[PDB]
Each structure stands twice: as C-alpha cells, then as structure tokens.
Write a protein that binds this ligand. Structure first.
Ligand SMILES: Cc1cccc(C(=O)[SeH])c1
Ligand SMILES: Cc1cccc(C(=O)[SeH])c1
Ligand SMILES: [Zn+2]
Length: 258
C-alpha cells in the first residue's frame, strides 16, 4: 500500500508514512505575485548546460526522469539565491489529466498544465544522497508549461515515451540538450522548501521561473498516455501526479525582478 496519487494513497495520506508532510517548509506553494518582494541583492541565475551529458530516461511509477551524468561538473546551476555550485542530476515533469491543472506551484492560484523540475545537488556535499539530508542540499529549477505552440526541444522526450510506458522501464537517452526546455527570460521567484513527493525532505532551494514555456496539446497528450502501473498490471494512466499547494508558514517568497 505504497504512496501515490490515488484516493487511497494520495497527498492527503502521505503524512502517515512521512510526518514531515505537515512540516515548516513544505512544497509546492502558491506564489502570491503581489506579496513576493523584489530582492535587489539576488544575482542573475547562471544556468550552464553546454556540457550536459544525458544518459537514460526512466519511468519510476510516479513520473519519468531524464537522468544525467553528474560524476563531474558538466551541467551546473549557480548564482541567484545560491551559494556554491549545484550539479544537474535529472529532470522530470508533473502534469494533469486536463490542461487546467497539473502544475505544483501556482501563481495567484493559477494552475498551469504541467511543471518541469530540473534537479541539482550542492557539490559541497559530495553526492546526491548526502545533499538531500541538508537544508541547502538541492536547487530545483521549476518551469511552468502552458498549452499552445509546440516546444521543439521537448519532442525528443515525447517521442521516446512509448518505450517506457510502464513503471520500471528505462531507455537509453543520450545527447539530449536541456537548454531547449528553457524560456527566454530567467526572471524567477525563490523560497526555501521541500521535495514535492515522498520522502518530502526539506532540502530544496526552489527557483521558479516566471515565464512559462509553451507546449502543444499533442505533446502533453503523449505525457498522459504513460502508466503508473507495471507491465501486465491493470492500466492506470499517469496523470495528476502533482501535490497541491501547501501552507507557506514562516516563509517569504523573493522575486528576482521588479
Ligand atoms: C506512453 C505512450 C504509449 C503509447 C503511445 C504513446 C505516444 O506517444 Se502515440 C505514448
Ligand atoms: C524524490 C525526489 C528527488 C529529487 C527531486 C524531487 C523533485 O524535484 Se519533486 C523528488
Ligand atoms: Zn518534481
């Protein structure tokens, strides 16, 4: 009876196995754009993905991860609110059954169709497993998806999904360039939070970009053909793999822009 996104194992149940679900810095949150304060002391983000080495795509039963070689400083996130150098390990999405829901963060209560998470770990902690035990261990770059024009740089991801339909399936996924998933502007909001899935560890500096990327209805329809189940198990579409907004508590969301 493992955690998931169903009636019987979804976000309202997670606190029984993961009591930090009711913690002081849980994610996601609603971003109240009028309350977020411009912090003129933040720096421009530095997103340096030129040397990225993608390896593999995995359906883990909750989402799909595009995994990177993080055994060297290749693809790194620095600057903005961050102290030091954060190495890209994987990206994944959260998405809806319908275009009107799917994002985890909201903006003035607006839900986007999906949300991309580019996961990075602080290299001062040596490995990802050590980094998730630290309050500044991860930096996740969150990018909203709206449905309109296709995103050409997403199509290589879309077109491999039929090969990882079910939980535990993986496929080689080399030479994928995550720069093709970024919007034009790196204006962002930032706050201290958590993983949005179990184990819900409070180890994340969130950096949520203001500008969404546009994807086509056909692109997101292909996300929605994935399965939560394993091969040879009843088909359960992988949709609505998002956690709703959690209490902000004693936190401030800072803006990089006026
Ligand atoms: C996950 C999955 C299964 C079967 C077909 C598709 C298409 O892209 Se069409 C995707
Ligand atoms: C379980 C886990 C590990 C690393 C990152 C996440 C998210 O971005 Se949500 C979740
Ligand atoms: Zn995520």
């Amino acid at each position: 009876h493992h955690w998931g996104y169903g009636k019987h194992n979804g976000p309202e149940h997670w606190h029984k196995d993961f009591p930090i679900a009711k913690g002081e810095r849980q994610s996601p949150v609603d971003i109240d754009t009028h309350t977020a304060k411009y912090d003129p002391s933040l720096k421009p983000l530095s997103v340096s993905y030129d040397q990225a080495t993608s390896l593999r795509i995995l359906n883990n039963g909750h989402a799909f991860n595009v995994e990177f070689d993080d055994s060297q400083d290749k693809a790194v996130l620095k600057g903005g609110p961050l102290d030091g150098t954060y190495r890209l390990i994987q990206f994944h999405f959260h998405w809806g059954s319908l275009d009107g829901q799917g994002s985890e963060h909201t903006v003035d209560k607006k839900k986007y169709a999906a949300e991309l998470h580019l996961v990075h770990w602080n290299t001062k902690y040596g490995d990802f497993g050590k980094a998730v035990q630290q309050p500044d261990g991860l930096a996740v770059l969150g990018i909203f998806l709206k449905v309109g024009s296709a995103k050409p740089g997403l199509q290589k991801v879309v077109d491999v999904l039929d090969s990882i339909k079910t939980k535990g399936k993986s496929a080689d996924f080399t030479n994928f360039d995550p720069r093709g998933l970024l919007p034009e502007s790196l204006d962002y909001w930032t706050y201290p939070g958590s993983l949005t899935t179990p184990p819900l560890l409070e180890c994340v500096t969130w950096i949520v970009l203001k500008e969404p990327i546009s994807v086509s209805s056909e692109q997101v329809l292909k996300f929605r053909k994935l399965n939560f189940n394993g091969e040879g198990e009843p088909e359960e579409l992988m949709v609505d793999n998002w956690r709703p907004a959690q209490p902000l508590k004693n936190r401030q969301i800072k803006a990089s822009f006026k």
